[PDB]
Design a protein around this nucleic acid. Structure first.
Ligand SMILES: [Mg+2]
Ligand SMILES: [Mg+2]
Ligand SMILES: [Mg+2]
Ligand SMILES: [Mg+2]
Ligand SMILES: [Mg+2]
Ligand SMILES: [Mg+2]
Ligand SMILES: [Mg+2]
Ligand SMILES: [Mg+2]
Ligand SMILES: [Mg+2]
Ligand SMILES: [Mg+2]
Ligand SMILES: [Mg+2]
Ligand SMILES: [Mg+2]
Ligand SMILES: [Mg+2]
Ligand SMILES: [Mg+2]
Ligand SMILES: [Mg+2]
Ligand SMILES: [Mg+2]
Ligand SMILES: [Mg+2]
Ligand SMILES: [Mg+2]
Ligand SMILES: [Mg+2]
Ligand SMILES: [Mg+2]
Ligand SMILES: [Mg+2]
Ligand SMILES: [Mg+2]
Ligand SMILES: [Mg+2]
Ligand SMILES: [Mg+2]
Ligand SMILES: [Mg+2]
Ligand SMILES: [Mg+2]
Ligand SMILES: [Mg+2]
Ligand SMILES: [Mg+2]
Ligand SMILES: [Mg+2]
Ligand SMILES: [Mg+2]
Ligand SMILES: [Mg+2]
Ligand SMILES: [Mg+2]
Ligand SMILES: [Mg+2]
Ligand SMILES: [Mg+2]
Ligand SMILES: [Mg+2]
Ligand SMILES: [Mg+2]
Ligand SMILES: [Mg+2]
Ligand SMILES: [Mg+2]
Ligand SMILES: [Mg+2]
Ligand SMILES: [Mg+2]
Ligand SMILES: [Mg+2]
Ligand SMILES: [Mg+2]
Ligand SMILES: [Mg+2]
Ligand SMILES: [Mg+2]
Ligand SMILES: [Mg+2]
Ligand SMILES: [Mg+2]
Ligand SMILES: [Mg+2]
Ligand SMILES: [Mg+2]
Ligand SMILES: [Mg+2]
Ligand SMILES: [Mg+2]
Ligand SMILES: [Mg+2]
Ligand SMILES: [Mg+2]
Ligand SMILES: [Mg+2]
Ligand SMILES: [Mg+2]
Ligand SMILES: [Mg+2]
Ligand SMILES: [Mg+2]
Ligand SMILES: [Mg+2]
Ligand SMILES: [Mg+2]
Ligand SMILES: [Mg+2]
Ligand SMILES: [Mg+2]
Ligand SMILES: [Mg+2]
Ligand SMILES: [Mg+2]
Ligand SMILES: [Mg+2]
Ligand SMILES: [Mg+2]
Ligand SMILES: [Mg+2]
Ligand SMILES: [Mg+2]
Ligand SMILES: [Mg+2]
Ligand SMILES: [Mg+2]
Ligand SMILES: [Mg+2]
Ligand SMILES: [Mg+2]
Ligand SMILES: [Mg+2]
Ligand SMILES: [Mg+2]
Ligand SMILES: [Mg+2]
Ligand SMILES: [Mg+2]
Ligand SMILES: [Mg+2]
Ligand SMILES: [Mg+2]
Ligand SMILES: [Mg+2]
Ligand SMILES: [Mg+2]
Ligand SMILES: [Mg+2]
Ligand SMILES: [Mg+2]
Ligand SMILES: [Mg+2]
Ligand SMILES: [Mg+2]
Ligand SMILES: [Mg+2]
Ligand SMILES: [Mg+2]
Ligand SMILES: [Mg+2]
Ligand SMILES: [Mg+2]
Ligand SMILES: [Mg+2]
Ligand SMILES: [Mg+2]
Ligand SMILES: [Mg+2]
Ligand SMILES: [Mg+2]
Ligand SMILES: [Mg+2]
Ligand SMILES: [Mg+2]
Ligand SMILES: [Mg+2]
Ligand SMILES: [Mg+2]
Ligand SMILES: [Mg+2]
Ligand SMILES: [Mg+2]
Ligand SMILES: [Mg+2]
Ligand SMILES: [Mg+2]
Ligand SMILES: [Mg+2]
Ligand SMILES: [Mg+2]
Ligand SMILES: [Mg+2]
Ligand SMILES: [Mg+2]
Ligand SMILES: [Mg+2]
Ligand SMILES: [Mg+2]
Ligand SMILES: [Mg+2]
Ligand SMILES: [Mg+2]
Ligand SMILES: [Mg+2]
Ligand SMILES: [Mg+2]
Ligand SMILES: [Mg+2]
Ligand SMILES: [Mg+2]
Ligand SMILES: [Mg+2]
Ligand SMILES: [Mg+2]
Ligand SMILES: [Mg+2]
Ligand SMILES: [Mg+2]
Ligand SMILES: [Mg+2]
Lengths: 49, 272
RNA sequence: GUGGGAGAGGGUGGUGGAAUUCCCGGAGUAGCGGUGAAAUGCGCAGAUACCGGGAGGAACGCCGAUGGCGAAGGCAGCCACCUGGUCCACCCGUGACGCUGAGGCGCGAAAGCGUGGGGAGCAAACCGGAUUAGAUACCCGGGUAGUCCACGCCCUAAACG
RNA sequence: CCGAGGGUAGGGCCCGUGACUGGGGCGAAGUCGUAACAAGGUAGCUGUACCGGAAGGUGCGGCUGGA
RNA sequence: GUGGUUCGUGGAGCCAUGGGGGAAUCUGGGCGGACCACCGCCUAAGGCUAAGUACUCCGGGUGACCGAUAGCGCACCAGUA
RNA sequence: CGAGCUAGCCCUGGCCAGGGUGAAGCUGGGGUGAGACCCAGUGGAGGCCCGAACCGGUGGGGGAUGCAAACCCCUCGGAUG
RNA sequence: CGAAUGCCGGCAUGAGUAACGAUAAAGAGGGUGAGAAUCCCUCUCGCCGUAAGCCCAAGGGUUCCUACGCAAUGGUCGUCAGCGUAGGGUUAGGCGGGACCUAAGGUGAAGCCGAAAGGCGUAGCCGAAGGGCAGCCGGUUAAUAUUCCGGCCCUUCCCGCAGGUGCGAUGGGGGGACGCUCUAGGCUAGGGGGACCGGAGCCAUGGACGAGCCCGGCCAGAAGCGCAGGGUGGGAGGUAGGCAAAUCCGCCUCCCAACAAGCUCUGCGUGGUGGGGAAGCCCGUACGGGUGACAACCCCCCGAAGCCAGGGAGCCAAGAAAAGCCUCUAAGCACAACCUGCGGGAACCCGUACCGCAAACCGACACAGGUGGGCGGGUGCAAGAGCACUCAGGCGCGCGGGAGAACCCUCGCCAAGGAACUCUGCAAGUUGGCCCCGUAACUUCGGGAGAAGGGGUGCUCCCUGGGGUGAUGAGCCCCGGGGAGCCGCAGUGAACAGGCUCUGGCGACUGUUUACCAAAAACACAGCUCUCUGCGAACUCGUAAGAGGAGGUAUAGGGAGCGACGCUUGCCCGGUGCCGGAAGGUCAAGGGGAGGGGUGCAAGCCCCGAACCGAAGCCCCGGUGAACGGCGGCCGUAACUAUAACGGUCCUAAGGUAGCGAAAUUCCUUGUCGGGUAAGUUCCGACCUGCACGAAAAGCGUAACGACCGGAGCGCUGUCUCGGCGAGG
RNA sequence: CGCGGGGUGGAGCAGCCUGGUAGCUCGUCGGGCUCAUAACCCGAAGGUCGUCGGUUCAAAUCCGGCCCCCGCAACCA
């Protein structure tokens, strides 16, 4: 039947986006750590135009 | 009135509709004086505070005039009488001679063509509005104010009305659609007559949908749910509550009074 | 037809006072209620009795009669509108148009029912107190439907001269 | 083609019968109470309504076949 | 009414405080474990102040530390696949 | 950290083949003092009826290291709310 | 280190075993090649065709196209490839998105709130398949094109000229602007027919040179018309409203119109011109090209759900905003500015390849699953998007070959019986579409109804009645009637297409639910009742601010239970709850201090501390059951026995009424009578000794309704006696 | 089998738990009123307390054993 991953570019940047994470105190920390851990990608790689 | 139906479908037998004869060939509302976008929504910021709402026909707000000392002395002619989805009372639209249009909740009687007005002057006739003092003790009246300049608030439901009782200082005793004798200030307007369309209390919704149309989702009894989400809940084949009847949140609901005790509004009240 | 007469005949709207019950203020105590006798009941948490105010409901004392009116049921404070019947005189008009009435139709006390309102007094059911052998009764204290209005039904009667 | 009749299907009227049940009629001397007739010891009768082992009671209005 | 101290209401001070009341300027004020007397110690309600102490992203030295299932997760283009 | 599955509601768009049944309401007639009411003809109502799309998931069978961590076949509910 | 279902890695066993991913299907010749069932070609066969064919959107991201290549990836093979190496390929003022607008909602100056982090928050901003908005048709590439090119046609800006006019705003008004269902007139898309027109060709096998078969008979298109249809009154005075001002809008009042007459604005034709253009035949593809061709390019018919669109009618549940656009005036400014024509110039950024019901997206996979929008041809079946076949197009589902045991899956058929099967007719069968006869109890007069039960259904000829388009006619296309006659076992001849009734239980009913074992008698439901709440309402969220409630106001809103409807819903307030009781008893801090202690020589300082004054709560006094709940025991009695209308007594707060009862409640129990049966622990009707019904956790009924549960009959049957043969996987 | 409740004049109930004292309503008997019966009035009688044991000076009363009676439990499988 229908599954749980229904990709959607908008929803994805809108939710796990970078400006998205900067906006909140908890998300900013999410960035810190990922930066502090090394992670090549701080946030998901949404795309297209 | 109240239209009836032959049983050509169970439900549309007991079903009963209103009679919109009193509706002056109007229907399409009046831009300008209303309508405004009406933000429908069953909960506040986030959560749902009143339960069981949502869904139900889209609606446009008819921005009515609920404080008439706006036009003291300026007479206006009642133009139409139309339907208002936001209330039980039908409403009348009227053109002042000032050239301004505005709606008023329509009183029983008021016919299209009639002239109506407000102010200390104003003749005591259906439609006219005046400060409570200047109104004849005993006359009935609707659309009362509670405090000078704050707008109408009492007897505005379909065909409801309040009767003046006496005077007493800068105050005048009323008798609200509920039976409470209240002391209102003299300077509160109150347009004379009863609200009209009193057949409203007689409409037999009819089916399940009918309720759904007016935006009210099904209502489930506490008795149906479990202990986890309401007092009356569990365990075997139904049950008799098992304790003093209570609400989802738990306070008694078969008798417990609510008005907050030490309210300042107490002293101006006298009844039930 | 013309001109008049009496009437609680009928419908709607409006209004008056007396009394009752309740609420509020004054004043005032030790009992009030009730019956053949009492008890239940009410009352020092302020009753009964008196005064002052307020709310509401229903029925209209005297006039009143053994009277009037209506086809019957039935109709009674006062005002107005709308409305039916009816009697008298004048003998003017039509000119036999009349009597009865299966059926249909309309009306129809009280109780009752539907939907909504109202609810003072009363009062089925019912609960208490007496009485009795026992009382699901007669008496006493409570008291709900109902009695009141609107509309829709219900068609009964010792609807009896 | 029609057609006596037979077959299938479902209605209409009637008679018979059925555990059990409703009230009824009749049956010399069983039990309960006393309702009516004298003013019947609550005048009675009444349409209706509710209640009660039972006659009956009470409410509303009516009648004299009572005062 | 509470917190801080070893102090959990204890005979419960002191030092902080939200609530209420509410002074004085050296013959003034706090403290020395309720309180009171004496004998002493300090001078609240303004502030700044090195060094000695903490740590190790980083540089260096050494190892009765490891030696590719060990050692950091990764000795190797790993916070990757 | 999650409502890109799912539950609810908000804003704004889309979708529902083809047949049945026939409500009120009109119109003509009947009737009455005037009605009620009775007839047709018209009319097209409806959590109405059959039935694709579509939304389901009743009964059986298969499938059960599957085609599939919910599937397949027959059968079936609703389908202008 | 030998064990911890230990941890990591490597290798065994099951085993050449199960599988090889839909049962839509393959065969052959010829290529290429080291190597072909599997790659290319051709011939034949089969499959989808409201798709298994085309166009978008979302997602994907090089998968597109071409060249060279098989180690791996392909469930086999592989010379193939969606795979490996390299190169090429996506062109826009008109499409979509942005230099336009606003919805929900976010953001958020002012303001308010919060230990901090942060929470709200009228203005503004942001926010989109909603509004506004200028491109159609054909040609070219191996791969792009409403983008390149051809033809035809537009939109803005800026700079000019030529004329007109008080011009002019984020401000005023108007407009834009709106539901659901049903719909008229005229068009288009699309499709059917043609004795007419245009064509390569073709007489097969017994007949046919025939108005013979086959193929095709358009597309776009400015101005101007023509045909439909949508919008809309024109004057003039008065004016105090439209938060300043208006000449505009609004409100009075006189005129003329009421018509679309006239102004506009769309659509559809027609239109200068521009373009396409079948079969077949020839060729070489991995495909496209050439000829047919000077191609013809015409006449009818059906006809929309699309267009005219802001069309109309009906209804109740009463149906966005903002901008663009018209208009009005204000500051300013009127040598500006704006409007109308004609020129010349300027017109940016991003997307465009390819997949797209799927081998490229969501499912670890070339996964029988999941995925919104548009087109979806023809004939026949009453209709249709259904069904069978079949156009265009696209497939044969990436392991094959044989064999023809059992046993499984899917399927077909059967003697005689027919439910005996079995927990249960589970399953399978029967029945089945349309047309016409004909339909009961009951009922809430609608329904029950497709009740049940029946007959008709093909083709041939004759006669005949309506329409519809054309003119009042031919044709062309729909609906009818009547009479003769033909052939089969059988005429919805294949495919799609109710088994039927009787009576019980539960629930009124349409709806809802345990995604992934329960779809129900459970939830919901109109409706009934109780209760709270007078409005800064109650209530709910929140620390607050706030927000919902509600831009509501007792015919209104919150909470509870009951659950269409009918007739009804008895008695107990002793206990608990809720409610009403300015008397009392008790009562915490606090007030008060009689009185007592500690220290001081002392004034003093510091403790304790009894009277009494002190809320709500409890006690107490009342009420209240559609509030929590409860609603008896033992004896005796009648002129056959039997039983008890009657009585006695004990205890209670009162001592279950009506109605129902071997029950969805009944243990003893297959109670006992009666009915169905040959036989009935189930079923139905009764009886009452109701272990342990009962009145809004309602009681007892109830037409209609049901993938709900029980009983029974008819029909029909492989369910069974009791099996048997056949088919494919 | 198990839990706890109960046997009192003729009937139905008290009487104990804090042992010495059996009480109430009805009924039965005698007498009255009435013509007579009932009612009502006046008086009177009746109880090995389920039984066998002992506990104490003394048992209806306290304690164990059986005889019936009534109610409650008999669950997980
Ligand atoms: Mg607006
Ligand atoms: Mg909130
Ligand atoms: Mg938020
Ligand atoms: Mg009602
Ligand atoms: Mg509910
Ligand atoms: Mg539950
Ligand atoms: Mg919760
Ligand atoms: Mg709870
Ligand atoms: Mg239960
Ligand atoms: Mg219980
Ligand atoms: Mg419970
Ligand atoms: Mg004469
Ligand atoms: Mg007569
Ligand atoms: Mg009557
Ligand atoms: Mg009456
Ligand atoms: Mg009374
Ligand atoms: Mg009385
Ligand atoms: Mg007596
Ligand atoms: Mg009389
Ligand atoms: Mg019989
Ligand atoms: Mg009989
Ligand atoms: Mg006797
Ligand atoms: Mg007597
Ligand atoms: Mg008498
Ligand atoms: Mg009597
Ligand atoms: Mg009577
Ligand atoms: Mg009585
Ligand atoms: Mg501490
Ligand atoms: Mg010190
Ligand atoms: Mg010191
Ligand atoms: Mg420092
Ligand atoms: Mg390592
Ligand atoms: Mg090594
Ligand atoms: Mg490691
Ligand atoms: Mg009709
Ligand atoms: Mg229809
Ligand atoms: Mg339907
Ligand atoms: Mg579901
Ligand atoms: Mg259907
Ligand atoms: Mg070992
Ligand atoms: Mg291993
Ligand atoms: Mg093996
Ligand atoms: Mg094998
Ligand atoms: Mg195998
Ligand atoms: Mg395969
Ligand atoms: Mg085919
Ligand atoms: Mg690649
Ligand atoms: Mg390719
Ligand atoms: Mg190649
Ligand atoms: Mg391979
Ligand atoms: Mg594979
Ligand atoms: Mg090769
Ligand atoms: Mg490649
Ligand atoms: Mg730019
Ligand atoms: Mg923008
Ligand atoms: Mg907004
Ligand atoms: Mg914010
Ligand atoms: Mg905002
Ligand atoms: Mg904006
Ligand atoms: Mg847009
Ligand atoms: Mg565009
Ligand atoms: Mg391409
Ligand atoms: Mg403007
Ligand atoms: Mg505007
Ligand atoms: Mg030949
Ligand atoms: Mg053209
Ligand atoms: Mg102005
Ligand atoms: Mg060509
Ligand atoms: Mg329209
Ligand atoms: Mg804007
Ligand atoms: Mg201007
Ligand atoms: Mg492209
Ligand atoms: Mg493309
Ligand atoms: Mg699609
Ligand atoms: Mg495959
Ligand atoms: Mg797939
Ligand atoms: Mg789909
Ligand atoms: Mg089509
Ligand atoms: Mg068909
Ligand atoms: Mg098909
Ligand atoms: Mg057979
Ligand atoms: Mg046979
Ligand atoms: Mg048979
Ligand atoms: Mg059998
Ligand atoms: Mg058997
Ligand atoms: Mg069965
Ligand atoms: Mg079956
Ligand atoms: Mg059945
Ligand atoms: Mg049934
Ligand atoms: Mg149901
Ligand atoms: Mg489930
Ligand atoms: Mg179901
Ligand atoms: Mg299921
Ligand atoms: Mg508010
Ligand atoms: Mg609001
Ligand atoms: Mg309510
Ligand atoms: Mg229920
Ligand atoms: Mg009680
Ligand atoms: Mg109580
Ligand atoms: Mg009480
Ligand atoms: Mg109280
Ligand atoms: Mg107190
Ligand atoms: Mg029984
Ligand atoms: Mg039997
Ligand atoms: Mg039998
Ligand atoms: Mg039972
Ligand atoms: Mg029950
Ligand atoms: Mg009750
Ligand atoms: Mg319930
Ligand atoms: Mg109950
Ligand atoms: Mg029920
Ligand atoms: Mg259903
Ligand atoms: Mg078989
Ligand atoms: Mg086989
Ligand atoms: Mg267990």
């Amino acid at each position: 039947m229908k599954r749980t991953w229904q990709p959607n570019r908008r929803k994805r940047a809108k939710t796990h986006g970078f400006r998205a994470r900067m906006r909140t105190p908890g998300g900013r920390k999410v960035l810190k750590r990922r930066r502090q851990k090394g992670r090549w990608r701080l946030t998901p790689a949404v795309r297209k135009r | 009135a109240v239209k009836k139906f032959k049983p050509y479908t169970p439900s549309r037998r007991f079903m009963t509709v209103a009679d919109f004869s009193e509706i002056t060939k109007t229907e399409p509302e009046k831009s300008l004086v209303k309508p405004l976008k009406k933000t429908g929504g069953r909960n506040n910021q986030g959560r749902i505070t009143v339960r069981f709402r949502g869904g139900g026909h889209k609606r446009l707000y008819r921005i009515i005039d609920f404080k008439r000392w706006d036009k003291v002395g300026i007479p206006a002619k009642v133009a139409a009488i139309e339907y208002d989805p936001n209330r039980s009372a039908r409403i009348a639209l009227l053109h002042y001679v000032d050239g301004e249009k505005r709606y008023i909740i329509a009183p029983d009687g008021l016919q299209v063509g009639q002239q109506v007005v407000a102010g200390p002057d104003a003749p005591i006739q259906v439609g006219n509005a005046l400060p409570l003092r200047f109104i004849p003790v005993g006359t009935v009246v609707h659309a009362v104010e509670l405090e000078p300049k704050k707008g109408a608030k009492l007897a505005r439901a379909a065909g409801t009305s309040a009767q003046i009782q006496g005077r007493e200082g800068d105050y005048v005793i009323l008798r609200l659609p509920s039976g409470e004798l209240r002391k209102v200030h003299g300077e509160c307007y109150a347009t004379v007559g009863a609200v009209g369309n009193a057949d409203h209390k007689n409409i037999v919704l009819g089916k399940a949908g009918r309720s759904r149309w007016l935006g009210r989702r099904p209502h489930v009894r506490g008795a149906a749910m479990n202990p986890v989400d309401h007092p009356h809940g569990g365990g075997e084949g139904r049950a008799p509550r098992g304790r003093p009847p209570a609400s989802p949140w738990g306070w008694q609901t078969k008798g417990l009074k609510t008005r907050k005790r030490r309210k300042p509004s107490s002293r101006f009240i006298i009844a039930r």
